[PDB]
A = this chain, B = another copy of it.
Amino acid sequence: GAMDYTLRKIKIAAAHSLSLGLLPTIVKQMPTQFTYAVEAIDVDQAVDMLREGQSDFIFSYHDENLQQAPFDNIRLFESRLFPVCANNGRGEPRYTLEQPHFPLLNYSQNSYMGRLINRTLTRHAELSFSTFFVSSMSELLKQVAMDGCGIAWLPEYAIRQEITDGRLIVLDADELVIPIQAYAYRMNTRMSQVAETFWRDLRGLQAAL
């Protein structure tokens, strides 16, 4: 998108596990002064797409490479990952964390969520699992979990209603809960008036996210 230019276009790259949950809320609450070009990326594409001008802003998670001096950021929200699974028809989990080699529905090895989930499982040797299904898309993992195919770590904002309906059941609310923080990243350099307006309004919007 380096050569691509309009007066109003905002070029956003967003992590796979974050696009659907976050973009509609921003698009709906932003002033009607922008147009949007958004592409889903893996976490490690973000550095180069910002520096090469392919994206104006990155919607990602905590990134040590991006929280340094050449970039600027604002924390959009924090959330938590819960291990969940479908119910057993009686309001109880269909699977148990203690089952030897329980079916795990995981994010990809090169994803931010996957790294923290694998780090968590490693520290808890009391848990053995067999990886049944791997995908980068949060909503794909969510649906596969809802269908009863195993246990998945999913962020609270994506499963809020399903926890209320009981279609998904939380398996642990303490040691296996993983904290996550979502950030918007940009270059420290001054940008166009429309992009600077977008950044200003996104900060003012952050409280309501």
Contacts and interface: CB of A to CB of B under 8 A. Distances in A.
Q: How many copies of this chain sit in the oligomeric assembly?
A: 2
A95 B172 CA distance: 46
B140 A24 contact: yes
A115 B197 CA distance: 32
Contacts of A140: 19-20, 23-24, 38
Interface residues of A, number: 28
Contacts of A134: 36-38
A63 interface: no
Interface in A24-44: 24, 27-28, 35-40
A77 B39 CA distance: 27
A53 B77 CA distance: 39
A108 interface: yes
A167 interface: no
Interface in A131-169: 131-137, 139-140, 143-144, 147, 149
A139 B139 CA distance: 9
A50 B28 CA distance: 39
Given A19-B137, A20-B137, A23-B140, A147 B36 contact: no
A16 interface: yes
A28 B147 contact: yes
Contacts of A38: 133-135, 140
A191 to B, nearest CB: 20
Nearest to A38: B135
10 contacts: A16-B40, A20-B139, A20-B140, A23-B144, A27-B144, A27-B147, A35-B130, A35-B132, A40-B137, A139-B139
Interface of A: 16, 19-20, 23-24, 27-28, 35-40, 108, 130-137, 139-140, 143-144, 147, 149
Nearest 5 interchain pairs by C-beta: A24-B143, A36-B133, A37-B134, A38-B135, A28-B147
